[PDB]
Design a protein around this ligand. Structure first.
Ligand SMILES: CO[C@@H]1[C@@H](OC(=O)c2ccc(C)[nH]2)[C@@H](O)[C@H](Oc2ccc3c(O)c(NC(=O)c4ccc(O)c(CC=C(C)C)c4)c(=O)oc3c2Cl)OC1(C)C
Length: 186
């Protein structure tokens, strides 16, 4: 797993030099979010392009199962297959990834670096909401040439996903210039 995806990134995520793979990192995370909506638990997904060239995806689904050794969420984030290659591949190809889960009345947080957790999933507070939030900074040792996220590419796929999932609200936000969109087609 981990190490092997790192050694041959292209085979799993696509062209690492023309931007195809870069944007598909985002799509893989969104697809995971889409599932929680297809399951009948998620109603709105928010995708954000931060000014430090990172992307975050948040939803209001159940939240990735926590609790145990390692929590079920850590297994999902670090074990290959524990088009959809998983967040585990996205995590291994990110120089930094931030994971936040709201489930069973608690706020859980964890940081990853090139797929390795700096520490175990920790509880940092109470909450009465549920949902998952993943924010990742693409590894510049893997991705070359096109290294910055393009809004139009994201907007194009997010719209098609909206039409194929009538009912789920999808919002796109660019913090680099204030652009924003809301897809909710019929
Ligand atoms: C990357 O994660 C994805 C999710 O991505 C996301 O939700 C996601 C990623 C990024 C963003 C913003 N959203 C989403 O694809 C999808 O979600 C599921 C898919 C199935 C279940 C499920 O059967 C439940 N039933 C339980 O009783 C339960 C309780 C304890 C427990 O140990 C397990 C087994 C553990 C796992 C991980 C299935 C199940 C439940 O409670 O929750 C689930 C969730 Cl949250 O699959 C993941 C593998 C967990």
């Amino acid at each position: 797993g981990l190490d092997a995806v790192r050694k041959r990134p292209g085979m799993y995520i696509g062209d690492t030099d023309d931007g195809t793979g870069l944007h598909h990192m985002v799509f893989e995370v969104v697809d995971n979010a889409i599932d929680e909506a297809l399951a009948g638990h998620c109603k709105e997904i928010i995708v954000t392009i931060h000014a430090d060239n990172s992307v975050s995806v948040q939803d209001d689904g159940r939240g990735i199962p926590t609790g145990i050794g390692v929590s079920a969420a850590e297994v999902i984030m670090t074990v290959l297959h524990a088009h959809g290659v998983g967040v585990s591949v996205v995590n291994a190809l990110s120089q930094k990834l931030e994971l936040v889960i709201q489930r069973e009345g608690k706020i859980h947080r964890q940081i990853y670096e090139h797929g390795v957790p700096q520490a175990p999933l920790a509880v940092t507070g109470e909450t009465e909401k549920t949902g998952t939030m993943v924010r990742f900074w693409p590894s510049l040792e893997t991705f070359t040439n096109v290294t910055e996220f393009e809004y139009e590419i994201l907007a194009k796929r997010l719209r098609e996903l909206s039409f194929l999932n009538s009912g789920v609200s999808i919002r796109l936000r660019d913090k680099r210039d204030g652009k924003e969109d809301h897809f909710h087609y019929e």
